[PDB]
Symmetry: D2
Subunit: 498 residues, 4 copies
């Protein structure tokens, strides 16, 4: 399995130290193997980080904060600007590494790095706008103001699916806001974590700044638990399951810390009878099949109107038959493999429980005979009452259910514990005003004639209910990475009444 | 113990139903006695709310939300405007009831109701500004927007010290934001809870609105626990101890709900050698003695500079000797009684543990022989290392400690788990920039030449660390009472690439 | 005439001093007669202000500013709160005076005073929100901030149509922003000017504030020219014709002053074939007939679709036949008289020039034989090419032109020099996105399925092109009444390189 | 002269077409000579633009707007991102060209281009933030919103001193805001105008966009007058004298257009007795001598405290004696030549009128015998009453006047017609609160312990009084380049009362 030469340009070797602390690479933890989901073959080896490595790096990361906080915000924005340009120079290579290690199709991965690049460009302008307020006081010779200050150290625990995009949105904002970043990437994604850190480390070194500003570790739940329990980390940004999310939240809340939660999503698309069937079918395909259904924003529930029901799914199966399943690096591939053999096993056992709950498999449902973790994109006719519908299967399974009124459609959409993304395909404005109103969708993302997956830097990305409540990317999200202080200065010689 | 006639104008009788649900007064719970802290005599009786009453009122409160959410925000602001005017008509009476039942001196109480009145006036203007955003999209024929919507039902659990001000700041914002309010007042403050509810109920009835919009209950931890566990309440605003705060937070976080925490404060005043000693002494007195030290913002720690140390405290004791201790309703009273006989017992046992930890009582420390819960205002010379300093005694005890450098002063101020309010008395601007900077105070409120207690409607009131993180009154605090939705409307016929 | 008595309740007599200069009433100018447009009979007499009176009042108004600017903004907001309550106590009487003196129907006038009261409620909250900004500096130990400060004296020149609403929007903002107000009301509306000033003067006196904070004068263009040329007045808010607007602007621009312009509006309503004809007809009637077409937002142009053309206007004439023309104080009156006999003469000569340009009068066009200034509501079939269309006639004349496509409709709407208000009546979502887009309406107010006249205090009211550019009421309009200063404080010992 | 070659690297030749109209280079106007102020020798020739060229380019620029306004704002921001990178590649060369053609020292010019590059980095983030608002309506089933739209074509008339920085601030904002830019550079700076346009044209061509988006012309007042009178240009951004500013304003106001005015500045530095004399002397030198006093922010007035008066100016003359006067391209040069021989003649005749008004020349005042336009840096002891003080001389002349109290100092600072920048050198916190307060400086820029010239892209740069009122760079300046529309959509079936 060569190259090799491709990994060397990303700064990777056969065996790699998986701990970036304190400006240098180390690792006294176990030696893990990085596998490609396309053939289940070794890309390289990673010497994981131990708690010993974590503590050594954490002592320096905390110490580096003093220096970093003192740097003016526009000057911090200039470091982030150079991070974006560093990523631009390796865009093509990082995209390939994301596809090779994670399993997502080449366009996605280039686009993932492109999302981080677009975020750096925004963070430069944002550095000039981390504004405070001068509030009028009700007392004479009193200056009242709202003051923002860095938190210190921001902990970032990321998932396998966006092995650098989640860090990108968090680190760009955290760094620009004067915070140091302690990153713990996915255990199955160590090479992307190293290559991403080497780009950041490059910029920090080029500007004579301590490498401890961007500390990173490769490992399992051990280092993750250490971050959640660390009193030196005021903010922990978690990205993963609702199961692990609550666990992290509980530990962080106990120590009076704050945490940004970006949890599981059971996203639904509602198709009204008056919808653009061509637009709706195309949208449903790319929302459900995209990243082999391993996206937080992946459409898992299809709420179909009775009038269009049959005609919609027969022309959806017709499109599902045309999905090219292959190597994510090969041109024309639409669906790649599932990240691990474990997820392939989970998908197959899920199909069995779906059948148990009365689910009728319209298309797919079977595994594909290959060296990699390949499965068929599945469409399931099921009742909304079935427990598997309220679950969250991280594979290409789409549950389709019939509805009569818009009131019953919203009832189904809001019934699930998760509240990340939702969509309606309709032409009538009365429905659009209902959908976006108080009695509409209870999600963080509410879309009209656009799928659940289409999300950009401009607006604050995040979910409600079981998806946490945390917000990323644009808007006023920066305020989560800083501390608000209400200040009042008395500059008058006037003494209080005796 | 008459009048009586004063209570009748506030709508109170000898025995009162303590449950306002569903637009009517009830109560199937136990009969509690409301005592005056000045003589420990019965004012009136309150028939508490049971879980049965809570459930009946909660079913209607949840149902009323549909109607309330549909009312335009400026029209909701008009209801709040009339609430302020209703309070203005009973300002004099409510102030007396706050003094009589809670124990705070007449000026405070009138001022407390005045704070609610000023909040209504702000909430009217705010109703016209619950603005969303139209974000530029990166895709042609796409409308991107940030949409705000009511949460539904806001739960408000209040403490004894501000028996209506805490509700006032919460309810004004919650109601204007389209939410219904379920209030559970202090168990020792039921009469203020009833009288406050009768004013709100008056306005709601006058406008043909369901009374269930403002549901209120009198009771113990039972009704409070019910609110924290209620899945129908997306936001729980808690005001009380850090002990109970964490308990409420834990229960609310488990059910994927949000909670606004306004917890305990161990507030400190730092006096620099170059300070206006006249201003600093006056400020320290009113910050420490005010409301018999039963304020969340009460100065409990005095961090004194060695150069001014002796000269400051001898002239502080000289002022402490001049504190008039009497009936809070009597003119000229500066210090009233502690809210309950239990708090008087806690104060006295605290003095004993303070002596154990090497605390040298400079002034007071003893109880006053009276029918009411009167104690002497205390000044204690103590080392910052003592455990009682990190505690929170809800009485008039001031711990004084010597410092040499501004660096050791900030070290002491930030050492405590609580982070609500802090102050510095200085004339040099280099210290002011350090104090308000990243290496300064870690509190939510950071004041210069003004005590820890002086807080107005204009700025977002709240604390950091063990004080939670929740914000009240002005600024962008309204966003906590609503849900953010990132919306994208595709209005173009353009189909995604095949 | 008697009543009389009703005038005494508003603080008016048979002969009134028309100059509120230096906290007291005076007037060395000519004696003018206030006439009722319903019968052309004398209500009372007003002793106008001379330039001598103006100068004496202007010296004190400028001097009072020192005191007023020193008052904290929330405390200034409390004065404007009290002004609203003072107006509430005389709501019924002011509405009657406005109707009697100006000629507008009783609902309007009562509604107009209510518009001012609503602005007072918003201004209280706004006083707490005149915020500055703390911008991050790119240099270490540098504090960068945006600072707002009062301008000093705000000059308000008002028109006859809104003899107190225009002042209300301006004065509420100006006063809260720390500015003194010098008011010059319309020469045909002095009694409203006096009665409005007496309410303000009442509040200012009750709070021991100099009356010079609110200076007001009754007179012609003489006092208006004096304001425009006065170097002591940094901001002149003008409300009137485009002819006088440019004159005021040119005198103010010459002396490096700023002016708020709220000029003429030749507002159009576009009716699409798919519109709710019942809604559109009702809307067109009240937009065109309302205030006898003497509103700045009055619909003067009806852009009708060919498919609905005939059917729309025959059912519009059917409705125009039902318009009750009578005493504005009499119940059921829909159309009252024109403000002066001069405006009645202008309307009649206009009808003649309309006939000259090929205008075919569908309904009305004639004067009504009575003692008052009554005219018939007119509908005119005309080509958009006609010059009279591009002009502004301040009477009930509606021009109606046929169109085929949306491009043609927008072409007509944008063709006029004025750009105040515009409306479309359609059900199509595409038309709305085009109408609100870059290629849509070029007006300050762009409405969908609502007439040109419906405007509230929540959003910034103002017009583009020949309507000036000035904004009133809500949003960020306050910034016009203050001066922005970009401040940078260097608090570091660092010296520049030698 | 040769180099030559260096010019070819910037896209310049011996003779250059000076009209970038309709995506290609032309010019039917006269042939002008570009001279170097260091020796008065020809760099190259420029074939100016005629009115014929202007009209041809203006027809296409107006036509290109349709395409440009349709491009999404984040996508427009990407073009401005690329413009910054294009400038980065030629940073070294442009700085040299600016120095060679304008006469400013090499650090400035390299610094000036860097100011543009910095603005490009901010404009990318700003493209994602040109937000509208969703205002709560007071009527049910009504959507109220604030909508921003491009103006169309922005006219930019620039001065000689910042031959590309002024365009940079304007064009970055204008382009991101969806407007086309028509640029008219200073007649004495055509080569900088061409080289700057070639960089923009490069990016526009690389992205298959019409070159007409960025139209530029070389010429005198002829093309400038054409822009001011052009009805196709809604916004004219003028940068020059107060004399030409008023002329442009009056022509633009007449046609109901808007204009951004960045006029003359007679900036003052106030030195208090308690100031850091080392900091104040260094600051005064670089503020007054910088760019040979040919900056809009150049310190022209020194307001000195009587206690420090003599000691300050003797140590200022001592520093003025050390000013290196030479070739701006030569290392170590602190003062270069004046832009033209005409400005050298104006400086010398000014010295004569200064002597007439009782001005006593402390240092300099004489011309330097060389081929270039070199003059001595001048210090003048003068009374504030002298008329020359209130004027603006565009050379290195510093007027110095004695003061006793802060009232007297502010009186002098505010006495001049111009209100751009102002500074105080003090250590007292009281003076700073007075200086930044309502009774302080009446300028747009108010600095403490930092000179009048130090201005960055974070805050809105602009002046008050005779400096216009227009704002550039950061803050909410973008709103000037777009049109605000207050929109209300009625989506309810409710009909108005018959
Ligand atoms: N803005 C603020 O931060 C703020 C304001 C006022 C008071 N306080 C804090 O209040 C404390 C003193 O007030 P207190 O003695 O009334 O507080 P407390 O914590 O004992 O109880 C306050 C309220 O919570 C209820 N409650 C108690 N335990 C509960 C539980 N487990 N679940 C649900 N409800 C429960 C009580 O019935 C009461 O209504 C101080 O620590 C003070 O700092 C804070």
């Amino acid at each position: 399995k060569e190259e090799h030469q491709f990994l060397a340009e990303l700064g990777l070797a056969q065996r790699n130290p998986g701990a970036f602390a304190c400006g240098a690479w180390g690792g006294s933890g176990p030696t893990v193997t990085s596998t490609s989901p396309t053939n289940n073959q070794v890309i390289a080896e990673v010497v994981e980080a131990s708690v010993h490595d974590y503590e050594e790096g954490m002592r320096a990361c905390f110490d580096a904060a003093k220096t970093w906080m003192a740097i003016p915000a526009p000057k911090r924005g200039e470091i982030v600007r150079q991070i974006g340009d560093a990523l631009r120079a390796k865009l093509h290579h990082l995209g390939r590494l994301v596809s090779l290690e994670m399993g997502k199709i080449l366009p996605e991965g280039i686009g993932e790095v492109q999302e981080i690049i677009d975020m750096c460009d925004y963070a430069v302008g944002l550095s000039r706008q981390l504004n405070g307020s001068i509030i009028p006081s009700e007392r004479p010779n009193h200056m009242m103001m709202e003051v923002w200050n860095p938190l210190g150290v921001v902990g970032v625990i990321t998932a396998f699916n966006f092995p650098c995009a989640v860090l990108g949105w968090n680190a760009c904002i955290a760094l620009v806001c004067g915070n140091c970043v302690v990153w713990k990437g996915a255990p199955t994604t160590p090479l992307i974590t190293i290559a991403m850190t080497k780009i950041v480390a490059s910029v920090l070194e080029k500007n004579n700044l301590p490498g401890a500003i961007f500390t990173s570790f490769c490992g399992g739940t051990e280092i993750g638990q250490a971050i959640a329990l660390d009193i030196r980390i005021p903010l922990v940004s978690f990205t993963g399951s609702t199961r692990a999310g609550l666990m992290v939240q509980q530990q962080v809340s106990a120590r009076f810390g704050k945490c940004l939660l970006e949890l599981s999503g059971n996203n639904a698309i509602i198709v009204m009878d008056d919808a653009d069937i061509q637009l709706a079918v195309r949208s449903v395909l790319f929302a459900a099949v995209g990243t082999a259904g391993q996206r937080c924003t992946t459409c898992r529930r299809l709420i179909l109107h009775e009038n269009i029901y049959q005609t919609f799914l027969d022309q959806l199966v017709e499109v599902y038959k045309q999905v090219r399943i292959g190597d994510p690096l090969e041109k024309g591939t639409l669906l790649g493999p599932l990240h691990t053999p474990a997820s392939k096993e989970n998908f197959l056992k899920g199909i069995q429980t779906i059948k148990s709950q009365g689910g009728k498999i319209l298309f797919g449902g079977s595994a594909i005979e290959s060296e990699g973790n390949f499965v068929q994109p599945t469409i399931v006719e099921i009742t909304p009452s079935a427990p598997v519908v309220k679950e969250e299967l991280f594979g290409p399974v789409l549950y389709v259910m019939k509805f009569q009124t818009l009131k019953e459609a919203i009832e189904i959409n809001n019934s699930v514990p998760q509240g990340l993304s939702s969509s309606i395909f309709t032409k009538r404005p009365d429905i659009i005003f209902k959908w976006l109103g108080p009695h509409g969708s209870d999600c963080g993302i509410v879309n009209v004639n656009i799928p659940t997956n289409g999300a950009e830097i401009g607006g604050a990305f995040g979910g409600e209910k079981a998806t946490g409540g945390g917000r990323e990317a644009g808007s006023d999200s920066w305020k989560q990475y800083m501390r608000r202080a209400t200040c009042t200065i008395n500059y008058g010689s006037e003494l209080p009444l005796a």
